[PDB]
């Protein structure tokens, strides 16, 4: 039965990503005054399927200079990690209930970067190296403040468990107590998913394509599948942490559906931003974070250590 639950958690998520691709294309088209995909199947629904079949039927390149082991391992790691991170998320009942779910999320996300790093180094191509060493700086940027922001927000939750946030937000969103942190966390997710205005590891304009330049066909398609699944995942994490849905032990369906609504809203906002803004430079990103968010982030962490004390509102443990 647990396997049936695994199927119900994987297959729908992958389909949702598949159609995130289509939704992105159509939303961008409409915002740019064009219609986007609408000839392949009714209203373009079949475009993701056609794309996936084409990519997995195209010849996968194996460039001579590459290192086959890493060049093959990296995409597998990307998709595996992106799929795995969906494991412990309460919606409202996590498939896997982990006490330190937040730390597990951080560990998996951090290991995600190694897919890009190894793929870029293994490509043995100059643009691949450019992409990999830009991803390194992207990580050096976001990772410093992501942990502090999570610490500060969890300082009202009392434990790293995700499910505890359901009760934490029983009578209120955590957004209101920590809207200043919600924004920094949102930008941090934008950077982590490697998406605009922070899509500097695959920026077409500067590097023909980044880490994925030499990748082709199915090995390539895995990278994008993981990218979009990660978009959905990170916006789900935002929806659970901030913007808490409505949980009543009587109906988990209410939590599930409200979570879906909010997660779609945020995922749409990602594409909204993509179409709306230019691209940061890969030193401006580090400067931005380190010299604007970190000075504010440390102060906010100090303040959220103080808050439970001088308000006598310590979070419960358990």
């Amino acid at each position: 039965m647990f396997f049936i639950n695994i199927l119900t958690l994987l297959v729908p998520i992958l389909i949702a990503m598949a159609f995130l691709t289509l939704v992105e294309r159509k939303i961008l088209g409409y915002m740019q005054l064009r219609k986007g995909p609408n000839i392949v199947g009714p209203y373009g629904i079949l475009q993701p399927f056609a794309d996936a079949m084409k990519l997995f039927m195209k010849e996968p390149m194996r460039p001579l200079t590459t290192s086959m082991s890493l060049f093959i391992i990296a995409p597998t790691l990307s998709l595996t990690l992106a799929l795995s991170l969906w494991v412990p998320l309460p919606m409202p009942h996590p498939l896997i209930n982990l006490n330190l779910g937040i730390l597990f999320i951080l560990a998996t996300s951090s290991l995600s970067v190694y897919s890009i790093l190894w793929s870029g180094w293994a490509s043995n191509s100059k643009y691949s190296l450019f992409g990999a060493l830009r991803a390194v700086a992207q990580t050096i940027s976001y990772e410093v403040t992501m942990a502090i922001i999570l610490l500060s927000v969890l300082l009202m939750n009392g434990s790293y468990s995700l499910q505890t946030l359901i009760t934490t937000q029983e009578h209120m969103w955590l957004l209101l107590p920590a809207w200043p942190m919600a924004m920094m966390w949102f930008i941090s997710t934008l950077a982590e998913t490697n998406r605009a205005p922070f899509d500097l590891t695959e920026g077409e304009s500067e590097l023909v394509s980044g880490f994925n330049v030499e990748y082709a066909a199915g090995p390539f398609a895995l990278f994008f599948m993981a990218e979009y699944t990660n978009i959905i995942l990170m916006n789900a994490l935002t929806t659970i942490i901030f913007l808490g849905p409505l949980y009543y032990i009587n109906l988990p369906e209410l939590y599930s559906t409200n979570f879906m609504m909010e997660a779609l809203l945020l995922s749409s906002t990602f594409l909204w931003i993509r179409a709306s803004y230019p691209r940061f430079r890969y030193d401006q990103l580090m400067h931005l974070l380190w010299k604007n968010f970190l000075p504010l982030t440390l102060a906010l962490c100090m303040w959220h250590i103080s808050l439970p004390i001088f308000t006598a509102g310590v979070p419960p443990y358990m």
Binding site: M172, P177, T311, A312, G313, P315
Partner: protein, 48 residues
Amino acid sequence: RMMRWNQERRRLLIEDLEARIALMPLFQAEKDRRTLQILRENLEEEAI
């Protein structure tokens, strides 16, 4: 709001922990007898 809600949760946590404390004596005796039974069964088999 977070202050007030957290205080309420503290009260509820104290209530539950008090329930655990109330029931613990029964569990301690049950564990005592169970572990002693396991040990004596082991001793019998070891004897054979």
